[PDB]
Amino acid sequence: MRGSAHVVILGAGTGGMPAAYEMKEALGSGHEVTLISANDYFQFVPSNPWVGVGWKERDDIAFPIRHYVERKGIHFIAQSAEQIDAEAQNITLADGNTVHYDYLMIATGPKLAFENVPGSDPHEGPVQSIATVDHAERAFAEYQALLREPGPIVIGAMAGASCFGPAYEYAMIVASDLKKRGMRDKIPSFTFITSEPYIGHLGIQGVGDSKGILTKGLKEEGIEAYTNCKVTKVEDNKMYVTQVDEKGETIKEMVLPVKFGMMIPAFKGVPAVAGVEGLCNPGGFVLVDEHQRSKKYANIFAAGIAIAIPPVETTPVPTGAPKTGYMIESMVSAAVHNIKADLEGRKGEQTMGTWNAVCFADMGDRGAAFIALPQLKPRKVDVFAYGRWVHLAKVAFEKYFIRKMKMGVSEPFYEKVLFKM
Amino acid sequence: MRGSAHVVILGAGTGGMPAAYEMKEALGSGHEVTLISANDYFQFVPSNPWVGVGWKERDDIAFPIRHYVERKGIHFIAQSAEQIDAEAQNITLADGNTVHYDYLMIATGPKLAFENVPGSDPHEGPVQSIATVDHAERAFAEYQALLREPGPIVIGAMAGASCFGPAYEYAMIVASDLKKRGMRDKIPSFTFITSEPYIGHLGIQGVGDSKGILTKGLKEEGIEAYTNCKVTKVEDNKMYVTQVDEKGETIKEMVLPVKFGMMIPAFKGVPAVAGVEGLCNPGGFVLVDEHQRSKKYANIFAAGIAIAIPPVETTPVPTGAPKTGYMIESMVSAAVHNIKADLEGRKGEQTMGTWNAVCFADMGDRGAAFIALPQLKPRKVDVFAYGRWVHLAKVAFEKYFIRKMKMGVSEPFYEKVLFKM
Numbered sequence A, B: 001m002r003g004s005a006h007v008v009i010l011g012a013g014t015g016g017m018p019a020a021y022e023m024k025e026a027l028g029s030g031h032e033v034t035l036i037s038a039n040d041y042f043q044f045v046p047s048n049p050w051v052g053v054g055w056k057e058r059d060d061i062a063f064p065i066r067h068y069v070e071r072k073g074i075h076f077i078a079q080s081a082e083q084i085d086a087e088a089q090n091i092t093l094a095d096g097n098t099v100h101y102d103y104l105m106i107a108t109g110p111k112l113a114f115e116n117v118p119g120s121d122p123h124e125g126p127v128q129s130i131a132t133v134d135h136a137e138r139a140f141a142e143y144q145a146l147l148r149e150p151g152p153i154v155i156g157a158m159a160g161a162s163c164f165g166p167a168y169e170y171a172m173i174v175a176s177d178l179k180k181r182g183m184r185d186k187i188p189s190f191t192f193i194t195s196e197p198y199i200g201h202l203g204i205q206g207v208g209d210s211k212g213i214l215t216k217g218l219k220e221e222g223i224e225a226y227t228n229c230k231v232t233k234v235e236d237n238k239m240y241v242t243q244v245d246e247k248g249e250t251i252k253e254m255v256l257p258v259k260f261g262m263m264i265p266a267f268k269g270v271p272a273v274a275g276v277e278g279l280c281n282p283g284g285f286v287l288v289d290e291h292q293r294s295k296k297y298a299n300i301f302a303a304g305i306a307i308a309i310p311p312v313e314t315t316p317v318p319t320g321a322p323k324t325g326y327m328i329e330s331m332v333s334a335a336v337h338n339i340k341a342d343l344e345g346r347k348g349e350q351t352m353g354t355w356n357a358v359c360f361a362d363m364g365d366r367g368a369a370f371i372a373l374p375q376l377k378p379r380k381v382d383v384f385a386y387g388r389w390v391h392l393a394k395v396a397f398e399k400y401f402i403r404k405m406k407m408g409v410s411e412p413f414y415e416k417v418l419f420k421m
């Protein structure tokens, strides 16, 4: 309402949860902050690969949202948005109720585009997913069925994927768990299929010695690896793969039987968001300016995987650059600051800052991590690390983030940097 | 004087220069700030290895101090301190004049302890030094004499050394320059001798894959490498080396002819500082608390290589941990803050923060760098990087630091971190 703006945050994930707390803290008691999300619980996404191999349980990485945001004055609606009318500024929920907003912050993350590859939906065949805790529990169930009846394994990343780290991670811990169960030698073949132009490209043209280190890691585990691949269909428990060369010409086709599989799908924008006229690019990603404001609607902002970021490279098989946690939080922080500014007359000048990608993968006793910025080479920081300490950092960060999501965030978030001061 | 404290900074190096500017900025017009140093010019130390192989000239890395600090209100005395009387609070200069102080900040850096190894002084034999621009110009002159009359090369680090990075760097660029001159095949032998327990220990128990990467680098260049070595004497152009095992027992002795050599010496405290009764440990390093205040004299502070830092490890051949640029600046910043606090009644609570080591080495087209913290394992950050980007960062940092040393420093120094914002 006038003088008491209603700010709605769509999606309670890595960007949306923090955004709700920060929005409420920034606006105070004079404004209404409503968080709307498809699930009633928060999940810590980077832990999903561990759930998928049974090293972690749902209860370790997820928790009910309601009580935590409500005690901060935030209204919570555990309902999926089905439709967004940007003119009337109304959101239609799954149950048919309508929520009005004065400002909308879209943090809806990715639609997992299984439809790009017929048969690839986790519910339609042997190719599973670890993108969400629901999918990862199902992936683990299929992993156990593999343990009962050993057969070929295929893990990797589809054409259009932008999130390659977790595929390597999942391949490695699957291999590790198989060894730990004395079951590794029962596996007929273990294949890694990726749309990357080379191993360890990671959608960012490589970082540090990612290529050499990931190549050697897969070889150490007896995992045969194919790059420049796109999967055309999954059918009769077989994966039809087409491999191209630098100029997109087919250099071979393959048919791989799959008893147990996991391919990271391409990400698109979720339907309620993509469905908003003039809001998104053809992928369903929100077109925003440097202030996280939609280029079409001045009272719509976006952060997280939901926003569109221009490519800088074009690979033989389509691939995308990842949108990772630290950059997401900078997007959120910026959106909250600029919305508050709007409420108080000013144009917020805050931006996301420099593009960066940061990723941590835990293999059990040791981890791998990278940091790359900015997007294009030569970079200011281009590092790849491996060791027990990376594992310890992942464990520590997970504990911290989950606690923050329960206790609330003021907050210039990453002051997890005073481990210096 | 009372109500107008006189603050003296001893030594105009990596810590002392910034300290003088920051002290003056922090105290203002009501207090006198005097900078006293042995040389009338500032030099950028990390560039010395390049001078030593002729890739850089003195004029690229050094400049006259006087006009730059004087225009900030800082008094400059280009004279070495010979004696410090901590009771009377008087400093005796080389020319016999005496300077009184109310507060003294010691930033005198290392005494290069050539006396530990008879014959090892650059002026007494073939073993040269790249620790200072004076030494590096002499090292380069000897390098040219090697070019005229090829003979064996020995590069490395003495027992008690704490600064290993530059030895590896110097070995690598010497090898590289020899190749570029079509002179590499004329060299009878190229040996690397270190007190480290293994290649790439770096006095910090290794960082990232420093061991594997430095080992392979030396092998690539046809440099034969010996660890756990101490040099007992240099005599008749021969280096007498003793190699021990884990328990300090001699496993062999060697006599290496040397036409051209460069060994990083052990560092001690400079004589004027070490000579102050009760100020220093037996190495001549100032004993300070976490606030950079001498444990004996409350109006004496210290920062940089001059302070004592307890060992965390004890190697078969004595070695030390390095004290590098970012930690030095945090020491300086702390000392300045706590001295100002003292002037205004309070006890400054500011500390150096977490121990860390950061180092950059430029090989020409590509560089190697590391970051390690804290000192003891398992670390929070333990990274080793290599690439063209490391080279670009070194080049950039040198330009920045030198410019800052001319323009002055307010200043919470490392905001060379807003390459993010």
Ligand SMILES: Cc1cc2nc3c(=O)[nH]c(=O)nc-3n(C[C@H](O)[C@H](O)[C@H](O)COP(=O)(O)OP(=O)(O)OC[C@H]3O[C@@H](n4cnc5c(N)ncnc54)[C@H](O)[C@@H]3O)c2cc1C
Binding pocket: A010, A011, A012, A013, A014, A015, A016, A036, A037, A038, A039, A045, A046, A047, A048, A049, A079, A080, A081, A082, A107, A108, A109, A110, A130, A131, A132, A163, A165, A166, A270, A272, A303, A304, A305, A306, A323, A324, A325, A326, A328, A358, A359, A360, A361
């Ligand atoms: C397996 C995996 C591992 C990852 N590892 C890392 C890592 O190590 N480091 C790192 O920095 N990043 C990592 N990422 C990338 C990225 O940080 C995460 O994907 C992150 O969760 C993205 O945050 P988000 O807020 O944009 O989307 P999400 O966290 O997915 O949140 C989106 C939210 O919106 C909700 N939603 C969607 N549609 C609707 C709708 N119509 N109505 C209401 N709610 C809706 C969803 O339920 C969800 O709650 C990982 C990604 C995955 C998939």
Ligand SMILES: Cc1cc2nc3c(=O)[nH]c(=O)nc-3n(C[C@H](O)[C@H](O)[C@H](O)COP(=O)(O)OP(=O)(O)OC[C@H]3O[C@@H](n4cnc5c(N)ncnc54)[C@H](O)[C@@H]3O)c2cc1C
Binding pocket: B010, B011, B012, B013, B014, B015, B016, B036, B037, B038, B039, B045, B046, B047, B048, B049, B079, B080, B081, B082, B107, B108, B109, B110, B130, B131, B132, B163, B165, B166, B270, B272, B303, B304, B305, B306, B323, B324, B325, B326, B328, B358, B359, B360, B361
């Ligand atoms: C070859 C080399 C490479 C290095 N590379 C790196 C690097 O890559 N990264 C990094 O972070 N660190 C590096 N270091 C380590 C460290 O950062 C430097 O040694 C740094 O210069 C130390 O700063 P300081 O202020 O303690 O001493 P210094 O910079 O040596 O300054 C001491 C000053 O005190 C003066 N002085 C000494 N005695 C007296 C006296 N009696 N009276 C008056 N003045 C006196 C000296 O002339 C000098 O000006 C390098 C060291 C060396 C030697």
Ligand SMILES: CCCCCCCCCCCCO[C@@H]1O[C@H](CO)[C@@H](O[C@H]2O[C@H](CO)[C@@H](O)[C@H](O)[C@H]2O)[C@H](O)[C@H]1O
Binding pocket: A164, A165, A166, A168, A169, A172, A213, A214, A216, A217, A218, A359, A360, A361, A368, A369, A370, A385, A386, A387, B208, B209, B212
């Ligand atoms: C985070 C995003 C990236 C993708 C996710 C993770 C992918 C899986 C990683 C597989 C790597 C396994 O392979 C491992 O690599 C490193 C090489 O750097 C080796 O380790 C080597 O360097 C490390 C330091 O970095 C040293 O501590 C170690 O002593 C040395 O041997 C290991 O001996 C090898 O076993």
Ligand SMILES: CCCCCCCCCCCCO[C@@H]1O[C@H](CO)[C@@H](O[C@H]2O[C@H](CO)[C@@H](O)[C@H](O)[C@H]2O)[C@H](O)[C@H]1O
Binding pocket: A208, A209, A212, B164, B165, B166, B168, B169, B172, B213, B214, B216, B217, B218, B359, B360, B361, B368, B369, B370, B385, B386, B387
């Ligand atoms: C900064 C303090 C440390 C000491 C100072 C410097 C010591 C000298 C460094 C010698 C290293 C030379 O050896 C070099 O190492 C790296 C391995 O990581 C290799 O490079 C490898 O990893 C890098 C990334 O980190 C990739 O960009 C590269 O494509 C890959 O081949 C090079 O092919 C090899 O030539």
Ligand SMILES: CCCCCCCCCCC1=C(C)C(=O)C(OC)=C(OC)C1=O
Binding pocket: A014, A046, A324, A325, A326, A327, A329, A356, A358, A359, A360, A371, A394, A397, A398, A416
């Ligand atoms: C340029 C700054 C990078 C941040 C590095 C320090 C600590 C944070 C690690 C990165 C990270 C972030 C930011 C993060 O938000 C996240 O969760 C989605 C992770 O997964 C575990 C991460 O690993």
Ligand SMILES: CCCCCCCCCCC1=C(C)C(=O)C(OC)=C(OC)C1=O
Binding pocket: B014, B046, B324, B325, B326, B327, B329, B356, B358, B359, B360, B371, B394, B397, B398, B416
């Ligand atoms: C933990 C923070 C580390 C700082 C990294 C970012 C940029 C600075 C590089 C380190 C460095 C410092 C601090 C530094 O003071 C210095 O000069 C003595 C260098 O030599 C070139 C350095 O390489």
Ligand SMILES: [S]
Binding pocket: A128, A129, A130, A131, A132, A263, A264, A265
């Ligand atoms: S997935």
Ligand SMILES: [S]
Binding pocket: A162, A163, A164, A165, A166, A322, A323, A324
């Ligand atoms: S990702």
Ligand SMILES: [S]
Binding pocket: A162, A163, A164, A165, A166, A202, A322, A359
């Ligand atoms: S990734």
Ligand SMILES: [S]
Binding pocket: A165, A166, A322, A324, A358, A359, A360
């Ligand atoms: S990631």
Ligand SMILES: [S]
Binding pocket: B128, B129, B130, B131, B132, B263, B264, B265
């Ligand atoms: S040296």
Ligand SMILES: [S]
Binding pocket: B162, B163, B164, B165, B166, B322, B323, B324
């Ligand atoms: S050093």
Ligand SMILES: [S]
Binding pocket: B162, B163, B164, B165, B166, B202, B322, B359
């Ligand atoms: S070093």
Ligand SMILES: [S]
Binding pocket: B165, B166, B322, B324, B358, B359, B360
């Ligand atoms: S260094």
